[PDB]
Amino acid sequence: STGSATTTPIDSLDDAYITPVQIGTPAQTLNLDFDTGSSDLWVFSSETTASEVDGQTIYTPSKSTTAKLLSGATWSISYGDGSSSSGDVYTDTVSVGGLTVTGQAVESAKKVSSSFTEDSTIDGLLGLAFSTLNTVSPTQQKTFFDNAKASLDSPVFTADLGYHAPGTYNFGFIDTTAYTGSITYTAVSTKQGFWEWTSTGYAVGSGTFKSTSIDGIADTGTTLLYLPATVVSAYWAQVSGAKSSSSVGGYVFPCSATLPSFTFGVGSARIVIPGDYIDFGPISTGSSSCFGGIQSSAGIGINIFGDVALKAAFVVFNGATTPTLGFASK
Ligand SMILES: C[C@@H](C1CC1)N(C)Cc1nc2ccccc2c(=O)[nH]1
């Protein structure tokens, strides 16, 4: 089997991407944030505290003939941005782009934090990291991908995120028309439960490439590119007037600037992020200070290749017995 679904930016900045997902019988379609940095499939639901729902589409398990309470199971998660959610668990039929999993754990939110309530466009998350990170207790549950894997034509999924445009998540096949040149594959460590890999270095604009190992995660659920302070300082030093602002919470730059590109290494290959991808717009409406798309990982404890980086590439998440990651230009 295979599946193929379009993923669409939630706003004009590409803050996140949403992908339609069919849950239950008859289908209830929710728009979920596919997140390769976590491993829970959770949704706004009929059980979510009413004051914490503001425009989201909800899953109502009582209206699904295939929903079953997973008795005694609870979940609770907190993300890198400090947001969180928790609740109980059903199993139900879940389909993505024509690919169907029966008995998928669908985690129903009883509580969500303010950032989730305020994001009316995101109806929940679909985690695509390794199932060892799944938060369900007392019986840990598998991700949608892990459940689907044995049925897939090939044990892979791909992320092809657009810049200010829709893109695609494919399951079970590699669309050889979706990228240019060749895909370069690189080793993954699953020891922390992430798609963790080591970049071979970077360049700023037309500058020379610096060979240096940068360990980090491929995370579709993180908006920005978070790298060591040395690398980030070297980037922003090439933008007149750019500075790190503690009051704003990172690097900002004059909105009048033209940003340089940023290149990252994948083995002997190179992925180029155009300068425009690094512009996240005015810090507040009408401001001439703009938020940068490359930020320091210093306070995080891990480097994160988020959407800013991933959208510049066609990315293969290879879930074979020894997982790997592939990157191609596009
Ligand atoms: C979807 C989820 C991510 C962790 C997976 N959070 C909730 C996205 C997010 N939303 C925001 C809303 C307003 C202001 C800032 C933010 C922000 O930084 N991130």
From Swiss-Prot:
Q: Which GO terms describe its molecular function?
A: aspartic-type endopeptidase activity
Q: Which reaction does it catalyse?
A: Hydrolysis of proteins with specificity similar to that of pepsin A, prefers hydrophobic residues at P1 and P1', but does not cleave 14-Ala-|-Leu-15 in the B chain of insulin or Z-Glu-Tyr. Clots milk
Q: What is its EC number?
A: 3.4.23.22
Q: Which residues form the Peptidase A1 domain?
A: 17-328
- One GO process term, biological-process aspect: proteolysis
Keywords noted in UniProt: Aspartyl protease, Disulfide bond, Hydrolase, Protease, Signal, Zymogen
> Any S-S bridges, and between which cysteines?
255-290
Q: Which family does it belong to?
A: Belongs to the peptidase A1 family.
The protein's name is Endothiapepsin
Q: Which organism is it from?
A: Cryphonectria parasitica (Chestnut blight fungus)
Which residues of the parent protein does this chain contain? 90 to 419 of 419
